[PDB]
Design a protein around this ligand. Structure first.
Ligand SMILES: *[C@@H]1O[C@H](CO)[C@@H](O)[C@H](O)[C@H]1NC(C)=O
Ligand SMILES: CC(=O)N1CCC(C#N)CC1
Length: 337
């Protein structure tokens, strides 16, 4: 995939450098895959300054390489990507530190720019002039913070193409490892201070439910998903490492019951999610990993479940809702090592 910096230089990373995207076209294909990178966030000046010292590529484009290798679902080789190997591939680097929700520019009162939501919109606009105008499906995918960003932006991308006069393009979402629980720790406020810092935006219907001061609720999958209109496939490890970090979990009866209860709660939030893939593993992210084809739930791989999803949106032995029921990490033999 080749780097293109955005022609509209007013849409910037944290430090004012232009945002961009990596692209690899496939001219015999009308399918487009836009992937959102992840990588936590920062919610005040002192904490964003620390990020700039040691995580600068997540805050600036000045040191980005000109190319990047497509891996996993972004791979063009059928052996590595049985799902969408012939699609047009786009990798959108995460340089706004706002879980892709911001719409605030750098100015005399703002040390950093938080324009995650505007970066996605500008990428879609400039892609239309490079072949996206002829697409029939646009899959907006992402991992970790990018997976949460899918949930916050998928309906706005569909509305953007509608108002631009492209009603035939079907917009869908693929959220990987971005389905978190606001549960009690083992031993929400950062998000809420972040939204004020970033001038963050959330989907309209969810915003109207929780109203001013409570938009932080829309960052949590099981609360925002029921308000979405576009089809969204949800991939989520039952024992996500980032979820265990924020829960201060690093085995006696107390912790055993805590971990078993966390998997039970996550499984409950997915009962009515018709397109989902939730293995009982302790891990983090999957869809751009090279070995993403190895894990299975009830005998069905993730690339197969995604293909079954495609067929359902036009089934015998081609399932789309796959959630483990065993209650301890790595009770599924296919978990990553
Ligand atoms: C550049 O992006 C900004 C922010 O979204 C927008 O207001 C402006 O209209 C854009 N400029 C052009 C020429 O599209
Ligand atoms: C692993 C990662 O990138 N995360 C975890 C928390 C989540 C929120 N809110 C998005 C950012």
């Amino acid at each position: 995939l080749r780097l293109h910096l955005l022609l509209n230089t007013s849409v910037t990373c944290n430090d004012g450098s232009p945002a961009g995207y990596y692209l690899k076209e496939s001219r015999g294909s009308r399918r487009w895959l836009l992937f959102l990178e992840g990588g936590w966030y920062c919610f005040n000046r002192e904490n964003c300054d620390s990020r700039y010292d040691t995580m600068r590529r997540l805050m600036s484009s000045r040191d980005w390489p000109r190319t990047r290798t497509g891996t996993g679902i972004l791979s063009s080789q059928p052996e590595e990507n049985p799902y969408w190997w012939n699609a047009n591939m786009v990798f959108i680097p995460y340089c706004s530190s706002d879980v892709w929700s911001g719409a605030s520019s750098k100015s005399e009162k703002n040390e950093y720019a938080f324009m995650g939501a505007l970066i996605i919109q500008e990428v879609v606009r400039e892609l239309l002039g490079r072949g996206l105008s002829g697409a029939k499906v646009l899959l907006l995918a992402g991992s970790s913070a990018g997976g949460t960003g899918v949930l916050l932006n998928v309906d706005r991308v569909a509305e953007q193409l509608e108002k631009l006069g492209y009603p035939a393009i079907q917009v869908r979402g693929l959220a990987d490892s971005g389905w978190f629980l606001d549960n009690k720790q083992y031993r929400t406020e950062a998000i809420r201070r972040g939204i004020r810092y970033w001038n963050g935006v959330v989907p309209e219907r969810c915003r109207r439910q929780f109203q001013e001061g409570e938009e932080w609720n829309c960052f949590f999958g099981y609360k925002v998903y029921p308000t979405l209109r576009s089809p969204v496939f949800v991939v989520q490890w039952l024992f996500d490492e980032a979820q265990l970090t924020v829960d201060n979990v690093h085995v006696q009866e107390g912790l055993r019951l805590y971990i078993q209860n966390l998997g039970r709660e996550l499984r409950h939030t997915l009962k009515d999610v018709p397109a989902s893939f939730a293995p009982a593993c302790l891990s983090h992210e999957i869809i751009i990993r090279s070995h993403w084809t190895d894990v299975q739930v009830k005998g069905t791989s993730l690339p197969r479940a995604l293909h079954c999803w495609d067929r359902s949106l036009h089934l015998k032995g081609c399932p789309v809702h796959l959630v483990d029921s065993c209650p301890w990490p790595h009770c599924n033999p296919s978990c990553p090592t």
